Write an enzyme that holds these catalytic residues in place. Structure first.
Site, PDB file in Angstrom:
ATOM      1  N   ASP A 162       0.869  -1.195   0.000  1.00  0.00           N
ATOM      2  CA  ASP A 162       0.000   0.000   0.000  1.00  0.00           C
ATOM      3  C   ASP A 162       0.906   1.246   0.000  1.00  0.00           C
ATOM      4  OD1 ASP A 162      -3.190   1.177   1.434  1.00  0.00           O
ATOM      5  OD2 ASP A 162      -2.283   1.411  -0.513  1.00  0.00           O
ATOM      6  N   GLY A 163       0.467   2.250  -0.752  1.00  0.00           N
ATOM      7  CA  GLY A 163       1.240   3.509  -0.775  1.00  0.00           C
ATOM      8  C   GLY A 163       0.288   4.671  -0.897  1.00  0.00           C
ATOM      9  N   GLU A 181       2.408   3.946  -4.716  1.00  0.00           N
ATOM     10  CA  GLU A 181       1.763   2.635  -4.962  1.00  0.00           C
ATOM     11  C   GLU A 181       2.721   1.625  -5.579  1.00  0.00           C
ATOM     12  OE1 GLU A 181      -1.965   3.112  -7.087  1.00  0.00           O
ATOM     13  OE2 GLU A 181      -2.701   4.264  -5.392  1.00  0.00           O
ATOM     14  N   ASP A 235      -4.542  -3.190  -3.800  1.00  0.00           N
ATOM     15  CA  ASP A 235      -5.738  -2.420  -4.187  1.00  0.00           C
ATOM     16  C   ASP A 235      -5.378  -1.266  -5.129  1.00  0.00           C
ATOM     17  OD1 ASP A 235      -4.579  -0.281  -2.615  1.00  0.00           O
ATOM     18  OD2 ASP A 235      -6.535   0.159  -1.770  1.00  0.00           O
ATOM     19  N   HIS A 270     -10.626  -2.821   2.352  1.00  0.00           N
ATOM     20  CA  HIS A 270      -9.992  -3.489   3.461  1.00  0.00           C
ATOM     21  C   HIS A 270     -10.791  -4.517   4.209  1.00  0.00           C
ATOM     22  CE1 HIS A 270      -6.837  -0.100   3.495  1.00  0.00           C
ATOM     23  NE2 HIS A 270      -6.797  -0.917   2.458  1.00  0.00           N
ATOM     24  N   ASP A 281      -1.810   0.035   4.891  1.00  0.00           N
ATOM     25  CA  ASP A 281      -2.379   1.387   4.814  1.00  0.00           C
ATOM     26  C   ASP A 281      -1.925   2.248   5.985  1.00  0.00           C
ATOM     27  OD1 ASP A 281      -3.954   3.523   3.759  1.00  0.00           O
ATOM     28  OD2 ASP A 281      -5.414   2.913   5.233  1.00  0.00           O
TER      29      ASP A 281
END
Length: 156
Positions: free
Chosen positions: A10-11, A48, A70, A125, A135
């Site tokens: 996650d970014g 990301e 995601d 999530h 996250d």
């Protein structure tokens, strides 16, 4: 057991472009290694991508990987075969201009070539604990940045 190393990434950024951070989780032989770093100034897309890269570049052996994210940005590129497009024309567009974030795409492609990966595109999530966590890590590092994203280019 006969299990693929598991990676979750996650970014994000606080304001796009602005301080950004990543969070990644690697899960192999009973052990789990997390990574996270904050950047003074970058973009969401960049963060990301960077979580996936750092993760994969951490494997020191040919693995069979399941990478769950995601990220609309990586999903877009993979599912649509953009890396294969770019690579064939030397990482340049129509314009003969270098592809956006080429620095990071090169990096990823380089990692793609050593491993066997299975992408898992997640939405929200709920039922996805490790993504939620990535996250938190990302938002947390984004607050106490300590790295420059040198590849980050104003212009476009």
């Amino acid at each position: 057991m006969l299990k693929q190393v598991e990676i979750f990434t996650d970014g994000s950024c606080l304001g796009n472009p602005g301080p950004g951070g990543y969070g990644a989780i690697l899960r192999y032989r009973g052990r789990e290694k997390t990574f996270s770093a904050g950047y003074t100034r970058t973009t969401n897309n960049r963060m990301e991508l960077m979580a996936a890269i750092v993760a994969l570049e951490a494997l020191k052996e040919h693995c069979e990987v399941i990478l769950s994210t995601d990220s609309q940005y990586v999903r877009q590129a993979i599912t649509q075969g953009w890396i294969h497009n770019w690579k064939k024309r030397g990482w340049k567009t129509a314009d003969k201009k270098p592809v956006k974030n080429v620095d990071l795409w090169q990096r990823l492609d380089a990692a793609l070539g050593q491993h066997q990966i299975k992408w898992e595109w997640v939405k929200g999530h709920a039922g996805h604990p490790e993504n939620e966590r990535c996250d938190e890590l990302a938002r947390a590092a984004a607050m106490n940045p300590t790295l420059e994203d040198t590849g980050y280019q104003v212009e476009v």
